Structures are given as structure tokens and as C-alpha cells.
Amino acid sequence: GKPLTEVEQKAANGVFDDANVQNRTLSDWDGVWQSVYPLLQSGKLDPVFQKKADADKTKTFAEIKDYYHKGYATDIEMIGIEDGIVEFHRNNETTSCKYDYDGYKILTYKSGKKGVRYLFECKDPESKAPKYIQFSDHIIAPRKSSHFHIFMGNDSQQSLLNEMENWPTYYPYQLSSEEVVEEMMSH
Numbered sequence: 001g002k003p004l005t006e007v008e009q010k011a012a013n014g015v016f017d018d019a020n021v022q023n024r025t026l027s028d029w030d031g032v033w034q035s036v037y038p039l040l041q042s043g044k045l046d047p048v049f050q051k052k053a054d055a056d057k058t059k060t061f062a063e064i065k066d067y068y069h070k071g072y073a074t075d076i077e078m079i080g081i082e083d084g085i086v087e088f089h090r091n092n093e094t095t096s097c098k099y100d101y102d103g104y105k106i107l108t109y110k111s112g113k114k115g116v117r118y119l120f121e122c123k124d125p126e127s128k129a130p131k132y133i134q135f136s137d138h139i140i141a142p143r144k145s146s147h148f149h150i151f152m153g154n155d156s157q158q159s160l161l162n163e164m165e166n167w168p169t170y171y172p173y174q175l176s177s178e179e180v181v182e183e184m185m186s187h
């Protein structure tokens with residue numbers, strides 16, 4: 001999409017006022033999405049971790065890698081979103097549901113940076129998909145997503161709000177691996 005404005009870029013970097021946060025519809029995440037965890041597993045994220053580790057004098061390669069290892073770990077390799085339905089692929093198995101939007105929650109991290117979780121819930125008694133999901137993607141108002149983090153669970157939304165360490169990360173499926181690493185190198 002368009003280059004971000006200064007304000008949007010500050011928002012993407014966790015600086016924004018709560019009054020500027022707006023609701024978003026599920027279609028912002030429409031598409032087919034690939035988990036980045038297999039890139040980590042195959043060693044393809046080594047140069048990202050090397051770059052980050054070289055830049056940060058306070059962190060070693062291992063600490064950076066462990067951080068993203070804990071972050072990206074998931075068995076959900078693919079997520080498809082269309083027509084109000086989210087479908088989750090785990091090995092050869094699929095689940096799906098027509099998710100109902102439930103608003104957003106603004107979180108403040110220890111650093112004082114902030115982030116917005118967009119909440120959805122599955123109320124279809126026949127579905128085996130996660131009852132609760134939350135999207136977080138460095139965007140606080142309607143805009144098609146470039147990559148997203150998703151929190152998935154069956155217990156409560158607060159349970160997912162409490163999750164800070166694991167944030168399964170998804171990029172558009174149409175991107176080649178080189179393209180994904182290229183984007184990651186710039187973050």
C-alpha cells in the first residue's frame with residue numbers, strides 16, 4: 001500500500017493516542033497467509049538474526065534467536081481468510097469458522113510502547129476452530145494488513161491479552177521466501 005505517513009509510522013512503532021484507534025473489519029486480513037516459523041526452522045532467518053544481533057550491543061545472536069523462536073512457534077502453517085470465514089491449516093487438517101467481531105483492546109507494553117489487538121469470537125457450536133482469536137499487525141485503523149500476528153485460544157479473550165511471548169506470524173502466501181526475508185531484514 002501507500003508509504004506510511006509520519007503519524008501512521010509512529011503508530012506502527014507503538015506511539016499513538018487511544019482516541020486515534022479505530023475499529024477494523026475482518027476483510028483487512030482477507031487473503032491466504034503463510035506462517036514464518038518454517039523459515040526459522042530451515043535456517044533462512046539466520047541473516048535477520050545476525051543483522052539484529054550485530055545492531056544491538058545489548059543482545060547476542062542466541063538471545064535474539066530464542067526470542068523469535070518463542071515468538072514464531074506454531075503448528076498452524078497456513079491461514080485462509082475470505083467471506084468472513086477464517087480457516088486454519090494444521091498438517092493435513094483444517095478447521096474454520098465465521099468469526100464475529102468483538103472490538104479492539106489497547107495494550108501498553110513494559111517499554112511504554114502500545115499495541116492494538118482486534119478481537120473476534122466463534123459462536124458456531126459446530127466449529128472446531130479456536131473460540132477466540134486476536135489480530136495484531138502494527139496498524140490501528142482500517143488498512144489492508146502486510147503481515148499479522150495472531151493469538152488463538154479457547155478459554156477467554158483476557159487469556160490471549162495476557163499472552164506476550166508467542167505471537168505466530170503470517171505473511172502473504174504469494175510472497176516467495178526471499179521476498180519474506182527481504183521484508184523482515186528491513187524491520
Ligand code: NA
Nearest residue numbers: 095096127128
Ligand atoms: Na471446523
Ligand code: NA
Nearest residue numbers: 076088130152
Ligand atoms: Na489454533
Ligand code: NA
Nearest residue numbers: 138149167169
Ligand atoms: Na512484530
Ligand SMILES: [Zn+2]
Nearest residue numbers: 053056057059
Ligand atoms: Zn549484539
Ligand SMILES: [Zn+2]
Nearest residue numbers: 137138147149
Ligand atoms: Zn510484526
Ligand SMILES: [Zn+2]
Nearest residue numbers: 145146147183
Ligand atoms: Zn509487513
